Design a protein around this ligand. Sequence first.
Ligand SMILES: [Ca+2]
Ligand SMILES: [Ca+2]
Lengths: 611, 31, 67, 149
Amino acid sequence: KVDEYGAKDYRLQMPLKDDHTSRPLWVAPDGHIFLEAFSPVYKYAQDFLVAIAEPVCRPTHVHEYKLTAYSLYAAVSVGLQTSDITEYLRKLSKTGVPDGIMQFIKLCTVSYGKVKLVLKHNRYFVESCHPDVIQHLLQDPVIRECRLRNSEGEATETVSFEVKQEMIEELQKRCIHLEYPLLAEYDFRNDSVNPDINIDLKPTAVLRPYQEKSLRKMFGNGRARSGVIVLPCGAGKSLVGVTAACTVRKRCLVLGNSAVSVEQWKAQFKMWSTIDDSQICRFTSDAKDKPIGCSVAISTYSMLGHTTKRSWEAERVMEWLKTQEWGLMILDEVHTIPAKMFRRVLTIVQAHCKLGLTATLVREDDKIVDLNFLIGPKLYEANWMELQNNGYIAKVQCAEVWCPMSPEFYREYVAIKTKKRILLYTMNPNKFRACQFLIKFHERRNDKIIVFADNVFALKEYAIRLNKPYIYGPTSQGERMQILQNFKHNPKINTIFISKVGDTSFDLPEANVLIQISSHGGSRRQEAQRLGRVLRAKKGMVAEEYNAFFYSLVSQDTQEMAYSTKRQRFLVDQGYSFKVITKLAGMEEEDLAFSTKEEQQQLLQKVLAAT
Amino acid sequence: EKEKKEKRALGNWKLLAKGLLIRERLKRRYG
Amino acid sequence: VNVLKGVLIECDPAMKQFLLYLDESNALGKKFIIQDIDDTHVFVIAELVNVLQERVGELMDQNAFSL
Amino acid sequence: ELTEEQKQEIREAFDLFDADGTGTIDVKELKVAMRALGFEPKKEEIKKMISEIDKEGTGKMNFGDFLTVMTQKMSEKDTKEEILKAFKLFDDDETGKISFKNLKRVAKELGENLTDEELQEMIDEADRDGDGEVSEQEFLRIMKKTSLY
Ligand SMILES: [Ca+2]
Ligand SMILES: [Ca+2]
């Protein structure tokens, strides 16, 4: 039922009880949950909702969470039954819990972990304690095709049965349709095929409370369970993965986005694990190492996604990997997994425990529902504002700066209607002046300035006119690291211009001032992840609530505005605010480029030359 | 290679022609 | 003689160029923007000016997002 | 959008040879109809357009194809005029050809870093008669095979 104002009239189905201020939760029958942070029971409710519900919005005071079948499965596999969840909900709900939500929870929890998938002898078996379920499922044609066929094409016979390797993800999706999701549980201590490894945790390793909480939630009753953990960049997420690998101590395979990711993973493993370097190898095309005796093998998706013929040695290493069965597999940048080629990698590799870590989980192509069974339920997601309060990461000062359009530029922008409009507003003379003023001001403040520009041409022109280092498609790796070290060590040069490769193609040194000029055009997760990775925790200004500075230049009256509001929405979900700065104080006195419009019309000439 | 260099010359011709077109258009816009 | 009584519009230069494009490109159709007047002011018939603002209403609409 | 009032002139030109009300006009009278609207193609162009119009050997063109041909001729004519203006911009010395000096002067004025060797390479690749430069007709032809305009 809907009110004339459009709001949902849930009052009738919600019996309100007098314990209003004491209880902090609202449970609408839509499945959504609302929590008040100012309530004294905030911490307990916070942990309960995190355990049971997937967070949606966490602004300063009131937070919204959501209930999903995957969230309920995660809660059940943690070890919580229906009665306890219902009791705790009713103890925290301001109003009575609607019977519809109760029934939904009952239906979800009554069948969770019913079906078990076992990887033994390089063979995948489906087994359970309810043979009627399995027998009834045999009628499903997709299950019939997924089931392993004999040499004669016949079907292979708590008795389990082998399933075709290629048809795992098909079974993964199908089981959801069968309302009987599989269980990704590993024999952490009962393992006998794969022995342990001489790898432990160095005493220098420190588990921050949220990291330890996430790890222990993953280790449900001491058994590792597949899932995804979301942590901000530089919050020890790599350290968290290293710690998990050390805990498992079984054969470990790690996949990174690029070669720099592999190098960082190897360095982190050396920095905190006791594994000897003889057992660490990088399955890359540049640094080749023998796979034999390699306890922890680090590679990239492309090195496993090569449909084309590889090098002969690469073929041998792939054969070794396929033969070997992995107790643990680690995937970084999970948001890139839903791509078809990378999804095929999961079928290619046979591993028991797969764990995914990333900074964001909102793929703009909404290919995330499948990921809930590609890997598993979202294990954890730390509150960004809470981590800011604890000082684990910098307390960022976000800002969106609007730049007026030159009349000639705006007339041209309106004249064009196709995708070619990108160049004009990305080359706004006023935007150039604003960026120059910001760079001058922060250099006078002695700040680490990193300027992003997704457009290749705009990046080149901006960096060259400002005479600052620029990195783009070519990105000669040796010279790339040379520029990075110049920024890190030389105080004379502290202004680095980086193209789209700054997302995941290399390592970003910790900075304090991040100026984003051009973006993908709606990649709400990509540039938010770029902001998270660029700005890290810095000593000295921890007490202040604004120790990291982020500026997003947007051209007024352009379509770019529509992108920015579309994009930073994700950061709004984390409580981050963006104050509009139409005009910058101090630009008048300081001399900047394009003071004359005669220069600006020459710039327009240059831009229009490239159509 | 022959067709590539021929197309390079054609592209240079096109770029020069468009540059002169834009120069004339903007000069007419302000003169 | 020839002196016109209509409605003048005063806006920022960006909107001025937008109106110039509307007149020249005939996006509104008939050239109802007979002639501008000043560096930030234009002179139009009141017959179309409403619909003129309509186009402007869409413009600032398209430079925004829907929640 | 192509034309608003010029179509009436094309209709009149077609109806001058469509006085019999057959809906089509003779192909042989195509030259006069073009001269009825100012077009003065040479014999080679007349033969080429008769070949394209009369592939099936009907000998007549209808209103739609005649209008399309006239619109194409007008577009090509204005394109030729703009190309001539561009040639005059290049041939600011009114030599009748865009010599290497003219191309170099335009390139330097354009500010491009196009090397003199590349300038002469383009000239030769745009040189057909072998005169050592690019003529009016050679420039017209290379614009006709231009990537886009
Ligand atoms: Ca000349
Ligand atoms: Ca010639």
